[PDB]
Design an enzyme around this catalytic site. Sequence first.
Site, mmCIF file in Angstrom:
data_model
loop_
_atom_site.group_PDB
_atom_site.id
_atom_site.type_symbol
_atom_site.label_atom_id
_atom_site.label_comp_id
_atom_site.label_asym_id
_atom_site.label_seq_id
_atom_site.Cartn_x
_atom_site.Cartn_y
_atom_site.Cartn_z
ATOM 1 N N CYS A 36 -0.308 4.225 2.314
ATOM 2 C CA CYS A 36 -0.506 4.144 3.758
ATOM 3 C C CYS A 36 -0.123 2.767 4.231
ATOM 4 O O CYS A 36 1.028 2.524 4.570
ATOM 5 C CB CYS A 36 -1.943 4.539 4.179
ATOM 6 S SG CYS A 36 -3.265 3.779 3.265
ATOM 7 N N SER A 37 -1.142 1.656 4.305
ATOM 8 C CA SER A 37 -0.688 0.382 4.936
ATOM 9 C C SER A 37 -1.684 -0.713 4.645
ATOM 10 O O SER A 37 -1.550 -1.851 5.092
ATOM 11 C CB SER A 37 -0.555 0.535 6.447
ATOM 12 O OG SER A 37 -1.823 0.807 7.030
ATOM 13 N N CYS A 38 -2.738 -0.302 3.651
ATOM 14 C CA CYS A 38 -3.853 -1.186 3.346
ATOM 15 C C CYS A 38 -3.363 -2.582 3.010
ATOM 16 O O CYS A 38 -2.390 -2.892 2.327
ATOM 17 C CB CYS A 38 -4.642 -0.622 2.181
ATOM 18 S SG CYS A 38 -4.903 1.104 2.462
ATOM 19 N N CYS A 95 0.874 -1.168 0.000
ATOM 20 C CA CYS A 95 0.000 0.000 0.000
ATOM 21 C C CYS A 95 0.909 1.215 0.000
ATOM 22 O O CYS A 95 1.376 1.652 1.061
ATOM 23 C CB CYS A 95 -0.901 0.018 1.225
ATOM 24 S SG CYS A 95 -1.936 1.533 1.310
HETATM 25 FE FE FE Z 1 -2.964 1.652 3.437
#
Ligand code: FE
Lengths: 211, 196
Positions: free
Chosen positions: B104-106, B101
């Site tokens: 961000c961190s998805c 991602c």
């Molecule tokens: Fe994310």
Amino acid sequence: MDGVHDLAGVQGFGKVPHTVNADIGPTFHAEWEHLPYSLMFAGVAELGAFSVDEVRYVVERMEPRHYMMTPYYERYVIGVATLMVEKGILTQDELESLAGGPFPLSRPSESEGRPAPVETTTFEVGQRVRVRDEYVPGHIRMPAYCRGRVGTISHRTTEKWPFPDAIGHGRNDAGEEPTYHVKFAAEELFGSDTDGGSVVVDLFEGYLEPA
Amino acid sequence: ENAAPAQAPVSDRAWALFRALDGKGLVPDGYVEGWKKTFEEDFSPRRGAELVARAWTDPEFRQLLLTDGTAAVAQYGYLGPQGEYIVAVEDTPTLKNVIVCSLCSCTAWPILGLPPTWYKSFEYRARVVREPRKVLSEMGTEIASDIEIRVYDTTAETRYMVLPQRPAGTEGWSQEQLQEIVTKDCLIGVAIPQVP
Ligand SMILES: [Fe+3]
Ligand SMILES: [Mg+2]
Ligand SMILES: [Mg+2]
Ligand SMILES: [Mg+2]
Ligand SMILES: [Mg+2]
Ligand SMILES: [Mg+2]
């Protein structure tokens, strides 16, 4: 928003701090680390105060140097706190009083967002599409490396979701759109300066146009 | 110039946020404790490993997993927060898939577990989209020259898992035996399953 969070393709970083299958330790490395996600869900699911998209955007709105020196879970503490203040649920005074010191927040939004596009196209697997050459100062789920670039549809989702550029600002006009897995050749995105094959980006219908 | 703002310790800020909301009756009894338990005990890459081992031993399930990932995962009851629309991506003798991602961190939380610190790092978020072969090499995974690397950037609601190739030397292994070699890193796509 063309913020520092849009990191894909940035050059100058060193090694990823991991070797495969190395021990990553416990899920939470400190006793507070479960709080940002849990309180995000309190805000989203229990209070109905904001969307997950608004959490993404408030983190994007961290002052850029602040974003770059802040650990991941801490960014979400700052982001959730900012939203609670912006929505009138908490005050910065009470946060700082309870914290016993400074609790700087994300910067105010400089865009009211935009509605879900009125005119879009339903695309099919195999079709060539271009990412709209558009600049959006508020929240958008299009990383800059694919802006204006051409790829092929490999999937159209069977579900639809609110347009991030609207719901990320808490607007009433986010509608619903499917997203598309768009496959780009590495060279389409980074010219000769890549060692990869292809990159698939999951793009809302409103970010796309026929090629 | 360019200096950090003054800030109270992060633990004090995080608990201040909790206390401010809790003191206003906005956080149900046992709420954050319940989420902590979900995050620590329920969301797990052992679930993704179970799906991979099933796909490896059951051609019918493999087809379902690759055509309707959501339905396949639902059969095990593993849909959940950040894992409601699932797509599994199939490695082949000429294709290696990797997930990131960049924004961000998805991450498909319920089946991969919460993302590890390294996955959320600026280094991974910046580099894997542009130089995945070098990144994987540095991490300990050499991708043969005749294999296309495909990076999936998790930019919307699709949540991904990699279905890695089944390694030689595992013929006839039980699902439990196969599950053991499918690690979190295999599901993200940065590692290939290893046989002792
Ligand atoms: Fe994310
Ligand atoms: Mg940029
Ligand atoms: Mg710090
Ligand atoms: Mg929902
Ligand atoms: Mg076989
Ligand atoms: Mg046996």
